[PDB]
Scaffold this active site. Structure first.
Site, mmCIF file in Angstrom:
data_model
loop_
_atom_site.group_PDB
_atom_site.id
_atom_site.type_symbol
_atom_site.label_atom_id
_atom_site.label_comp_id
_atom_site.label_asym_id
_atom_site.label_seq_id
_atom_site.Cartn_x
_atom_site.Cartn_y
_atom_site.Cartn_z
ATOM 1 N N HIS A 68 7.471 2.346 -4.012
ATOM 2 C CA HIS A 68 8.517 1.286 -3.995
ATOM 3 C C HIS A 68 9.840 1.848 -3.467
ATOM 4 C CE1 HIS A 68 5.662 -0.768 -6.840
ATOM 5 N NE2 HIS A 68 5.914 -1.714 -5.922
ATOM 6 N N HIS A 72 8.787 1.363 2.186
ATOM 7 C CA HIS A 72 8.166 0.083 1.754
ATOM 8 C C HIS A 72 9.074 -1.082 2.166
ATOM 9 C CE1 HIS A 72 6.075 -2.894 -0.572
ATOM 10 N NE2 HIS A 72 7.135 -3.089 -1.345
ATOM 11 N N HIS A 106 14.034 -6.438 -1.160
ATOM 12 C CA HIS A 106 13.166 -7.122 -2.163
ATOM 13 C C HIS A 106 12.818 -6.190 -3.332
ATOM 14 C CE1 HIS A 106 9.590 -5.174 -0.524
ATOM 15 N NE2 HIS A 106 9.008 -5.520 -1.667
ATOM 16 N N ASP A 107 12.881 -4.866 -3.158
ATOM 17 C CA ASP A 107 12.551 -3.903 -4.247
ATOM 18 C C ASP A 107 13.745 -2.983 -4.550
ATOM 19 O OD1 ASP A 107 9.993 -4.467 -5.276
ATOM 20 O OD2 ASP A 107 8.988 -3.326 -3.704
ATOM 21 N N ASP A 217 4.519 -8.202 1.240
ATOM 22 C CA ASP A 217 4.607 -7.206 0.149
ATOM 23 C C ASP A 217 3.297 -6.417 0.043
ATOM 24 O OD1 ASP A 217 6.029 -5.879 -1.691
ATOM 25 O OD2 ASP A 217 5.628 -7.276 -3.332
ATOM 26 N N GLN A 269 -10.016 -1.137 -6.020
ATOM 27 C CA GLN A 269 -9.525 -1.653 -4.722
ATOM 28 C C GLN A 269 -10.372 -2.875 -4.345
ATOM 29 O OE1 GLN A 269 -6.705 -0.670 -2.704
ATOM 30 N NE2 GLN A 269 -6.384 -0.235 -4.883
#
Ligand SMILES: Cc1nn(C)c(C(=O)Nc2ccn3cc(-c4ccccc4)nc3n2)c1Cl
Ligand SMILES: [Mg+2]
Ligand SMILES: [Zn+2]
Ligand SMILES: [Zn+2]
Length: 315
Positions: A68, A72, A106-107, A217, A269
């Site tokens: 993050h 990113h 956004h993060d 994202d 995953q």
């Protein structure tokens, strides 16, 4: 407009592809972002001096965490660029502006911990914001930076337009709370299959932008396999550190956050691609057909995780 931003030949061509990787040279990422803003918005959307100062303040307020992080932020922004470039008639002047900035921001100030951990830890942010705790913090951090001297990249907007674009940014950042994605995608799917979906309806637009934010994202699952596989190490580095912190609070972490369960990552995953990623890029492709390459690259990576599970590939 006499000073245009240019990229080397390989980057100029490959930045248009959804599966572009922005590379390991962090000093190029601000240039890549400005380039994307000038091409998706226009070279008159922002004063380059304010934008550059905004970018460097955003970079500074991202933390040195495995996933993050600043890289990113720029990677999510690049996925939004690719969506907007391939759907250029569908979005307004304010939306192109607002969505690239929302993606970059956004993060902001992410410490590598989920909303769940902040609630269990009883972090002050959890008292301030009961739902979408981290996401409401990311928006708050965005507003703080926009309000620094020389950082108002929206200074040429009217009061009302400024308020519209901050509302686009707020909803976009809140939409990156994956907890909200399940509800949002179901509503969009029902709206699409009944033919009620209306891009002229603002509440409908908000949902489409929300899904685009999720798609951006999660876009690590839409890269070429070598990128997808290496990025999974960074994602799990954070999950497992959070799982360690859950154990320190005397709480059993969920399996994806337990580093002792490393051998079950391929099946985890596979689970994530089937329950979240494939449905996400499927619904997005239905609404925005030119986003097909995100779905195709996601299905290719799903096939790679299956090849790992069958022992034809190591990870
Ligand atoms: C990109 C990206 N952005 N996010 C938020 C994700 C994610 O959420 N990925 C997930 C989800 C659920 N998982 C379960 C397991 C797992 C592991 C080991 C044993 C048992 C289960 N691993 C998981 N990974 C990915 Cl990808
Ligand atoms: Mg995340
Ligand atoms: Zn987030
Ligand atoms: Zn993110």
């Amino acid at each position: 407009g006499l000073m245009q931003f240019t990229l080397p030949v390989r980057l100029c061509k490959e930045i248009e592809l959804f599966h572009f990787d922005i590379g390991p040279f962090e000093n190029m990422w601000p240039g890549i972002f400005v380039y994307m803003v000038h091409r998706s918005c226009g070279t008159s959307c922002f004063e380059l001096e304010k934008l550059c100062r905004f970018i460097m303040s955003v970079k500074k307020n991202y933390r040195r965490v495995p996933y993050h992080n600043w890289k990113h932020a720029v990677t999510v922004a690049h996925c939004m660029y690719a969506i907007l470039q391939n759907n250029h008639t569908l979005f307004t002047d304010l939306e192109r502006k607002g969505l690239l900035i929302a993606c970059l921001c956004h993060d902001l100030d992410h410490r590598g911990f989920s909303n769940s951990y902040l609630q269990k830890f009883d972090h002050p942010l959890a008292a301030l914001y009961s739902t979408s705790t981290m996401e409401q913090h990311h928006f708050s951090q965005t507003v703080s930076i926009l309000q620094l001297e020389g950082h108002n990249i929206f200074s040429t907007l009217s009061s009302s337009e400024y308020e519209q674009v901050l509302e686009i940014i707020r909803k976009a950042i809140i939409a990156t709370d994956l907890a909200l994605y399940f509800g949002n995608r179901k509503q969009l799917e029902e709206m699409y299959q009944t033919g009620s979906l209306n891009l002229n309806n603002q509440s409908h637009r908000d949902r489409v932008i929300g899904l685009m934010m999720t798609a951006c994202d999660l876009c690590s699952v839409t890269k070429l396999w070598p990128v997808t596989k290496l990025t999974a190490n960074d994602i799990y580095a954070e999950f497992w550190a959070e799982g360690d912190e859950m154990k320190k609070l005397g709480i059993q972490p969920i399996p994806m956050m337990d580093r002792d369960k490393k051998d079950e990552v391929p099946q985890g995953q596979l689970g994530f691609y089937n329950a979240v990623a494939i449905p996400c890029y499927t619904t997005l492709t239905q609404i925005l057909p030119p986003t097909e390459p995100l779905l195709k690259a996601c299905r290719d990576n799903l096939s790679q995780w299956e090849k790992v599970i069958r022992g034809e590939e190591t990870a």
